[PDB]
Every structure is written in C-alpha cells, then in structure tokens.
Amino acid sequence: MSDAVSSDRNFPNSTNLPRNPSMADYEARIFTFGTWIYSVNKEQLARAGFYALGEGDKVKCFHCGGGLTDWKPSEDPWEQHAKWYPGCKYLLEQKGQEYINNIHLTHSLEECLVRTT
C-alpha cells in the first residue's frame, strides 16, 4: 500500500505554495546572482536548475550537485550541466535520457540559420 505523502492531491497543507515563478523564482534566483551579467539572463540559467550562493558568478546545481563558475560569453545551462554531470531530476525527465545522452556526445543547438553564416 503506497502511502504517498506528497504526490496525490493538491493543497499539501498551507504554506507550501504551488510555484509562483514571478515571485520566488525569476526575481528570487536573479536576486541571488545580482545585476551583473555575462551571457544569458541568470534567471534562464536558474530555471534549468541553478542558484547563486551570494557571491557573484559562483553558482551550483540543485540536487544533482556540481558547481559551475567562470561562464562562457555564449552558452546555455542545459548543455553545460548535461555535459559536465547529467544527473538533474527535471532536466533529465524534461527531454528524456535520449536528449541528455545526445547532448553529451556532439555539438548541439544553433540550427537553421539561412546557410550557416
């Protein structure tokens, strides 16, 4: 008999809010990174599964672990994390193990651009 003390129905208790992206996700994550920037919006990076530890740039992955620093002028979080250590909960399940494996093998993204410049 599966008890299931989390995934079953809505309204867990009270404090546990649904999610609220533009309340404790977009502004919250970014607030941890700072006004500073480098490549993409830090929020986007956080959405994938990243969170700053107070200090600028020093950011680590959630659950899966693995710290990331000294980002590249043009790079995505999906490819970065998946390449160094593909073991995130939502990240893996998002595009299945197939996508994660494909990413960690050859170059990805950047397709359909007139004629490869």
Ligand X SMILES: CN[C@@H](C)C(=O)N[C@H](C(=O)N1C[C@@H](Oc2ccccc2)C[C@H]1C(=O)N[C@@H]1CCCc2ccccc21)C(C)(C)C
CB neighbours of 52 closer than 8 A, spacing ≥ 6? 29, 32, 33, 34, 42, 46, 58, 59
Residue 55 makes contact with ligand X by CB under 6 A: no
Residues in contact with 41: Cβ distance below 8 Å, sequence separation at least 6, in sequence order? 30
Query: Near ligand X by CB under 6 A, which window of 25-33, 43-51, 66-74, 98-106?
Result: 66-74
* Residue 42 near Zn ion by CB under 5 A: no
Q: Is 45 in the site for Zn ion (CB under 5 A)?
A: no
Residue 68 binds ligand X (CB under 6 A):
yes
Strand duo 50-52 + 59-61: pairing: antiparallel
Q: Which residues are annotated as a binding site?
A: 61, 64, 81, 88
Contact positions vs Zn ion (CB under 5 A): 49, 61, 64, 81, 88
